[PDB]
Amino acid sequence: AEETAELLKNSHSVIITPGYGMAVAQAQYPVAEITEKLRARGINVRFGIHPVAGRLPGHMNVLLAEAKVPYDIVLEMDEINDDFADTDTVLVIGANDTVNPAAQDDPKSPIAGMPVLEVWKAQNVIVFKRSMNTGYAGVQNPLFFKENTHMLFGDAKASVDAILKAL
Amino acid sequence: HGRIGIPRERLTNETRVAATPKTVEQLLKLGFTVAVESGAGQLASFDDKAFVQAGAEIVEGNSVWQSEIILKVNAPLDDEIALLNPGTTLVSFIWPAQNPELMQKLAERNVTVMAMDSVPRISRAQSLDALSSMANIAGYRAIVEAAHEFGRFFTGQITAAGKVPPAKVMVIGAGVAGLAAIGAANSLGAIVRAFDTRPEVKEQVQSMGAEFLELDFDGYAKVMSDAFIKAEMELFAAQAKEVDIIVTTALIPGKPAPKLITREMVDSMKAGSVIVDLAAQNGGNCEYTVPGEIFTTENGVKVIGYTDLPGRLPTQSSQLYGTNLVNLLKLLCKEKDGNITVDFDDVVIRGVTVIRAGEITWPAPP
Amino acid sequence: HHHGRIGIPRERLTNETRVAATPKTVEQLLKLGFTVAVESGAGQLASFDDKAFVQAGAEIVEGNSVWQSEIILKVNAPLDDEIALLNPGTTLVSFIWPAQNPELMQKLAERNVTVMAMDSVPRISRAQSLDALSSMANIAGYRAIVEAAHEFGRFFTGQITAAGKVPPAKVMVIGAGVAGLAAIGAANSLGAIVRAFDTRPEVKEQVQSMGAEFLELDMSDAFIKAEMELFAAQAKEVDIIVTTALIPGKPAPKLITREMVDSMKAGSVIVDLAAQNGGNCEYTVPGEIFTTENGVKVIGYTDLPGRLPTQSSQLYGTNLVNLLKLLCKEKDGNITVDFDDVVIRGVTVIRAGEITWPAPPIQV
Numbered sequence: 012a013e014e015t016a017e018l019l020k021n022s023h024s025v026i027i028t029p030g031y032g033m034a035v036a037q038a039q040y041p042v043a044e045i046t047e048k049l050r051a052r053g054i055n056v057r058f059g060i061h062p063v064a065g066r067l068p069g070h071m072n073v074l075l076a077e078a079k080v081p082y083d084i085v086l087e088m089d090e091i092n093d094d095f096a097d098t099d100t101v102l103v104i105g106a107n108d109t110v111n112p113a114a115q116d117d118p119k120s121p122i123a124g125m126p127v128l129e130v131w132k133a134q135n136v137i138v139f140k141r142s143m144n145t146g147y148a149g150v151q152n153p154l155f156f157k158e159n160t161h162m163l164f165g166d167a168k169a170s171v172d173a174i175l176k177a178l
Numbered sequence: 179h180g181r182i183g184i185p186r187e188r189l190t191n192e193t194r195v196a197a198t199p200k201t202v203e204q205l206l207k208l209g210f211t212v213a214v215e216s217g218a219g220q221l222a223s224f225d226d227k228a229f230v231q232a233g234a235e236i237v238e239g240n241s242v243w244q245s246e247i248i249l250k251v252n253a254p255l256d257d258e259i260a261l262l263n264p265g266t267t268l269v270s271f272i273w274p275a276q277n278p279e280l281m282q283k284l285a286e287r288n289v290t291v292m293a294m295d296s297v298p299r300i301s302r303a304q305s306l307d308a309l310s311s312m313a314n315i316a317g318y319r320a321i322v323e324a325a326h327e328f329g330r331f332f333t334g335q336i337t338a339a340g341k342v343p344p345a346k347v348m349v350i351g352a353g354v355a356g357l358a359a360i361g362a363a364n365s366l367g368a369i370v371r372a373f374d375t376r377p378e379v380k381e382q383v384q385s386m387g388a389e390f391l392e393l394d395f396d397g398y399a400k401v402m403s404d405a406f407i408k409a410e411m412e413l414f415a416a417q418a419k420e421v422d423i424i425v426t427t428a429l430i431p432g433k434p435a436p437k438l439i440t441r442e443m444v445d446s447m448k449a450g451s452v453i454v455d456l457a458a459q460n461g462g463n464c465e466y467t468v469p470g471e472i473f474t475t476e477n478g479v480k481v482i483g484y485t486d487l488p489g490r491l492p493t494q495s496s497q498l499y500g501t502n503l504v505n506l507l508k509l510l511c512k513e514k515d516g517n518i519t520v521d522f523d524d525v526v527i528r529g530v531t532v533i534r535a536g537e538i539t540w541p542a543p544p
Numbered sequence: 545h546h547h548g549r550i551g552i553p554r555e556r557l558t559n560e561t562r563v564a565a566t567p568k569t570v571e572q573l574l575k576l577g578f579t580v581a582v583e584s585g586a587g588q589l590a591s592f593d594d595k596a597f598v599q600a601g602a603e604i605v606e607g608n609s610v611w612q613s614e615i616i617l618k619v620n621a622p623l624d625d626e627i628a629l630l631n632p633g634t635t636l637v638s639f640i641w642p643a644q645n646p647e648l649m650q651k652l653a654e655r656n657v658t659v660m661a662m663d664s665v666p667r668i669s670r671a672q673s674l675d676a677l678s679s680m681a682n683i684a685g686y687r688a689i690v691e692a693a694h695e696f697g698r699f700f701t702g703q704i705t706a707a708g709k710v711p712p713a714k715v716m717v718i719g720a721g722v723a724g725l726a727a728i729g730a731a732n733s734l735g736a737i738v739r740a741f742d743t744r745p746e747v748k749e750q751v752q753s754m755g756a757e758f759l760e761l762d763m764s765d766a767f768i769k770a771e772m773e774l775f776a777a778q779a780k781e782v783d784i785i786v787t788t789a790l791i792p793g794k795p796a797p798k799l800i801t802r803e804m805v806d807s808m809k810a811g812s813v814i815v816d817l818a819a820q821n822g823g824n825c826e827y828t829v830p831g832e833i834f835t836t837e838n839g840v841k842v843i844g845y846t847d848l849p850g851r852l853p854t855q856s857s858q859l860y861g862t863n864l865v866n867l868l869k870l871l872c873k874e875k876d877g878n879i880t881v882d883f884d885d886v887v888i889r890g891v892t893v894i895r896a897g898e899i900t901w902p903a904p905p906i907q908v
């Protein structure tokens with residue numbers, strides 16, 4: 012997370028992606044404080060709430076209201092593709108399969124033809140996954156391996172919780 | 179014999195019974211014999227053998243009336259007055275300020291008339307306070323029948339295709355019913371809001387999960403003021419642009435509900451929306467409200483004046499009315515024992531005891 | 545002519561409150577580079593101000609004019625008169641139920657329209673964004689909770705009320721897919737005691753996440769009867785059975801026996817969401833409620849997906865928006881009828897008269 016801190020302040024645009032990690036780890040409550048802080052810094056934040064991600068439709072949408080995250084920055088399944096390219100630190104809070112190329116580009120993942128958030132080769136895609144483990148697949152997707160698209164080997168809450176005070 | 183009689187509600191199109199099986203059990207515990215009419219709860223889905231599950235004597239028709247406690251679910255109609263017996267602890271929704279005629283009539287029947295609506299509205303008494311418990315249930319149920327006719331979800335959610343926005347619910351005239359309506363909408367995941375003159379309710383509104391809309395401006399003097407009714411109508415004009423549910427709540431016992439929202443402004447409200455008028459059982463706080471119906475305002479605000487709302491959630495209203503009645507009979511049968519010790523020094527009981535054994539004892543120490 | 549213009553009919557189905565797109569959805573369609581036309585009186589169904597369609601950006605046409613467009617985004621089948629209005633070429637996009645509607649198919653093929661079956665979108669993952677049945681089931685999941693609470697005896701929420709403690713609703717969601725998930729969400733939000741069941745292992749994690757008891761699997765034969773035994777022994781304890789269990793293209797199995805219903809607690813509701821495609825409960829009176837002796841409101845509302853006017857119109861409309869996103873990927877404003885992608889290849893049951901049903905076998 013010590014990286015992700017410096018990375019955040021660099022970003023200008025930040026896509027926060029709520030895919031499962033957010034919810035399970037309660038990372039939505041602390042995210043609300045840090046995003047508010049990023050807002051004060053002047054950072055173009057977009058939450059990309061793709062519904063079909065991990066567990067149940069909506070869910071994390073109202074969980075962000077619980078966290079008291081503004082619905083202005085909550086973009087629910089808005090295909091904010093052009094901002095995706097413009098974004099530097101995409102905080103992929105878990106969410107690997109919801110952004111997984113091998114689900115649509117390759118018809119390969121069990122989630123057959125998943126409309127994944129096309130954020131590969133953005134400016135940075137820090138995928139909060141504590142291991143290269145199978146999500147609903149995550150077969151061979153550059154989001155695991157690459158330099159900008161890379162697995163942050165930390166928990167969803169834990170990583171947010173450090174960057175919350177670090178930044 | 180000290181037998182509690184649980185009737186069916188024989189008022190036309192009321193949906194309660196006095197007690198559900200679970201609550202009948204609680205009346206057994208009280209040390210009285212408990213008899214329920216032949217399948218009295220079928221309005222609220224519980225038959226004879228369902229009350230045999232609780233362990234209730236199924237009094238076969240009229241023998242229900244021959245009992246020293248009759249937990250009537252609403253007022254006796256003259257039919258039932260004739261059926262009542264003197265000396266009986268007739269514990270019911272009497273509505274004394276709405277029913278001075280009934281007061282004179284039950285005085286002639288010489289009954290101990292305990293008006294369940296007329297409990298002193300204080301902390302300790304809230305468990306006995308049927309007025310507020312049924313209002314509370316009706317508040318929850320107003321939110322229900324609002325989602326029955328609502329265009330949208332309360333529950334904001336991105337679905338596999340599209341965004342559902344969280345609904346904006348404005349409760350207006352926040353009685354206890356309004357507070358529970360906030361709790362209901364909040365459980366469903368709606369942006370809840372509330373307005374009333376009285377600052378006492380705000381604490382609860384904020385807690386159960388809502389924005390208490392300030393009067394963009396004593397409490398009675400304020401409430402009467404012309405600029406105040408302007409200011410209310412400005413809060414209403416403002417919310418009309420955005421809201422999804424309005425719950426019109428300010429029901430007064432006796433007085434018809436103040437017609438707050440002028441018809442014009444309802445037409446101006448955001449369409450695909452509901453105004454559930456709880457206050458519809460006397461007057462109703464919207465001016466559109468024809469009691470009984472869903473009047474769809476031509477924009478698409480269905481002003482649902484369901485007068486029968488406290489009835490409408492049948493087993494709940496029965497369960498909790500039953501629990502208010504058990505609560506009363508707890509302090510009425512403190513020893514157990516099983517004898518109706520009607521208290522006077524306990525001023526809340528002195529409240530509810532609007533008539534005792536003939537002589538009208540209404541009103542009561544405030 | 546009216547290429548690049550949409551036509552949205554006022555829907556003429558009985559027990560209907562949907563239009564194909566509400567004002568917000570009309571704006572969506574506008575954003576997609578199209579122009580919209582809607583029939584007059586659509587608002588009345590959708591409980592929305594009809595003038596607000598114009599205010600949003602729709603030509604509120606008087607009626608049949610709607611049919612002369614690029615795409616006719618329409619909710620249910622074209623009735624046979626509407627069929628005779630369908631313009632040769634025009635991309636018609638509706639609930640077709642292809643295999644169930646052989647003759648309707650033929651009539652639309654003669655009318656030479658580009659029929660896309662919004663119900664029969666080949667149900668993989670991006671398909672669900674396009675699939676009208678996803679949103680309709682999701683409508684019905686919430687709507688199971690609502691219509692349940694319309695006839696429910698108790699609260700959902702275990703509110704320790706002033707009067708006394710509430711025994712909560714135990715919401716036994718059978719068939720946790722899509723509508724099941726929405727019912728689980730809604731009931732969990734209320735803090736009703738959710739118990740849910742679905743065949744696929746993935747739902748287990750989800751039910752567990754919502755503080756909700758997952759009913760274990762004890763398949764197909766032999767198991768179908770153990771599902772029955774679970775649902776009976778569970779029906780004793782539960783309140784609201786949200787019976788979603790539907791297998792696409794098959795009638796909903798009669799898992800809720802009348803006997804099972806009459807064994808339950810009173811004051812309770814079994815909502816058949818799968819009512820229209822088979823009836824999962826037996827006691828399901830299609831298009832009505834029926835209260836039993838024991839006191840369970842079996843709500844067999846076939847019309848559940850229609851029952852929530854503005855949002856149903858919104859979400860069906862956004863399924864259409866997602867379809868036009870995959871079709872008109874440039875968002876140029878005319879219907880690029882994509883055949884390269886599997887999903888459009890399957891949903892376009894009839895490309896302009898030529899019956900292009902199905903897609904090559906894309907295993908769901």
Ligand SMILES: NC(=O)c1ccc[n+]([C@@H]2O[C@H](COP(=O)([O-])OP(=O)(O)OC[C@H]3O[C@@H](n4cnc5c(N)ncnc54)[C@H](OP(=O)(O)O)[C@@H]3O)[C@@H](O)[C@H]2O)c1
Nearest residue numbers: 030064065066067068105106108109141142146147166167
């Ligand atoms: N939401 C719905 O409506 C719904 C319904 C049904 C199915 N689904 C499906 O779920 C699919 C996958 O979505 P998804 O990628 O969001 O979820 P997922 O596949 O369940 O999770 C993906 C990854 O998130 C990581 N993660 C979880 N908790 C985290 C934490 N505490 N700390 C760090 N990393 C965390 C895990 O990696 P580590 O183990 O290494 O941490 C896991 O491999 C969707 O494409 C959709 O098909 C969604």
Ligand SMILES: NC(=O)c1ccc[n+]([C@@H]2O[C@H](COP(=O)([O-])OP(=O)(O)OC[C@H]3O[C@@H](n4cnc5c(N)ncnc54)[C@H](O)[C@@H]3O)[C@@H](O)[C@H]2O)c1
Nearest residue numbers: 063667668669719721722741742743788789790791792908
């Ligand atoms: N990738 C995603 O995030 C996503 C999300 C939702 C659905 N889907 C797709 O939807 C497709 C079809 O499923 P659906 O849910 O839309 O269908 P549906 O609405 O016709 O059926 C609803 C549910 O009923 C369940 N059911 C059937 N028989 C059952 C039984 N005997 N006991 C218990 N439950 C039973 C099914 O499992 C299904 O989930 C799936 O193959 C999947 O590809 C994908």
